[PDB]
Design a binder for this molecule. Structure first.
Ligand SMILES: CCc1csc(-c2cnc[nH]2)n1
Ligand SMILES: CCc1csc(-c2cnc[nH]2)n1
Length: 185
């Protein structure tokens, strides 16, 4: 793809993080802690899942960023409305304000309702995410496989400002402790 010149510097917003997440000093990495990280609760924190938002809000233009997912067994990535539900149980869908893909149990799926099977021959170590606000597009790219297309959400109805969205996943298996990392430009 040729989206690299729309690169944006994303940082993670601590205040939105599930209380078990550990965000690095530079706000560019996040991992699941083995316990509560000793922060106060607030109405913004994701309560049920190991999720966090980027600080940046997008309401126009074209944006591109990359995320490192090396050795993880489970994660969700994409964008979401600024006003998505934070508390309780919910599914990742455009109806609920999410445009995402994930890895779960050795399969990759797009967060449509119902979910869509993805066809990935080369397991990605880094994912590229492209948003075209005006066109209503969110696309995902396999950086490990020379930028090949993973999935395009088109005819998106964003209906609000967008934020970068991350889920590091649970670590019940002991094989999913590795971080998500925002890759340098
Ligand atoms: C919306 C994120 C979500 C729904 S259910 C779920 C889960 C992860 N592991 C077991 N269940 N995560
Ligand atoms: C890792 C996927 C896998 C292993 S063995 C297998 C399969 C065997 N027979 C049909 N399908 N699929």
């Amino acid at each position: 793809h040729h989206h690299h010149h729309h690169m944006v510097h994303i940082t993670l917003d601590r205040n939105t993080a599930n209380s078990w997440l550990i965000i690095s000093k530079d706000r560019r990495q996040v991992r699941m802690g083995d316990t509560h990280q000793n922060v106060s609760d607030n109405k913004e924190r994701f309560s049920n899942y190991p999720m966090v938002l980027g600080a940046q809000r997008f309401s126009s233009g074209k944006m591109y960023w990359e995320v490192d997912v090396t050795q993880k067994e489970a994660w969700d990535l994409g964008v979401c409305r600024d006003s998505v539900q934070r508390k309780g149980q919910f599914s990742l869908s455009p109806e609920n304000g999410f445009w995402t893909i994930w890895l779960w149990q050795d399969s990759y799926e797009a967060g449509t309702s119902p979910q869509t099977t993805l066809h990935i021959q080369v397991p990605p170590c880094q994912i590229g995410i492209f948003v075209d606000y005006e066109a209503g597009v969110v696309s995902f790219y396999n950086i490990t496989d020379h930028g090949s297309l993973i999935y395009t959400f088109s005819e998106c109805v964003f209906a609000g400002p967008l934020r970068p969205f991350f889920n590091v996943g649970f670590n019940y298996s002991g094989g999913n402790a590795a971080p998500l990392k925002l890759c340098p430009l």
